[PDB]
Amino acid sequence: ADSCIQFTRHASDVLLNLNRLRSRDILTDVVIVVSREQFRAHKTVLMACSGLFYSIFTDQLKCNLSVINLDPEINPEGFCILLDFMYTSRLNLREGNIMAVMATAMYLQMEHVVDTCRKFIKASE
Amino acid sequence: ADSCIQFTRHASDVLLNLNRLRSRDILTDVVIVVSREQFRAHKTVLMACSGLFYSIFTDQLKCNLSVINLDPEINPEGFCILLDFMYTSRLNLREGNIMAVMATAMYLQMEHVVDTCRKFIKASE
């Protein structure tokens, strides 16, 4: 209905609770492997944030996998920063990580992160 | 780090995608039964929105259940309105449903919904 009222903080409160579940390893259903590193997560959050994960977990075979191995060229710290951003809306973008963050965001298909990385690089030229 | 940047719309975009997955029945992992009615959902979203579901799915036995039956006194339309609110931040509160919505929100332990229901009732007195 068009007669709805809206709770402004609801979406951010939901994301805060999803991040608390992730931190406590509650109902995490996939391990993302990035070279030597493993990251536990919720497939629905990954799909909701990334075009690559959306494609992976809507596949009729890959939806059932409990482990996903990323391309060996993917930087684990870049992935970690992006996983934190997925669960918090906060991106720890720094001079020392921007190239890895941008390359990882391009691979994961996260257009808004790619956009801000491009803008921060262009400003330093 | 305290040097993070934040994407304002991220949390709402995540919730919109979780609702699209729910609508298409993608990776839904629980059926909530409310009398004759069945509602498919994601346990993590339910826990993130409701004190009752948070308690249920953190229980070492109940976390594994694929079906949860609610108390027979719970109104299915009241539950439907609250499930939509969980996935959208929008509450379809109307004169004809407010009593059922408030009672359901008290049972599910959704304090902000209970608060607005109380305020709307008090205004009509």
């Binding site: 709805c4 009222i5 809206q6 709770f7 402004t8 903080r9 | 929008r90 902000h112 607005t116």
Partner: peptide
């Protein structure tokens, strides 16, 4: 919080 969206 609550608002008219």
């Amino acid at each position: 919080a609550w608002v008219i969206p």
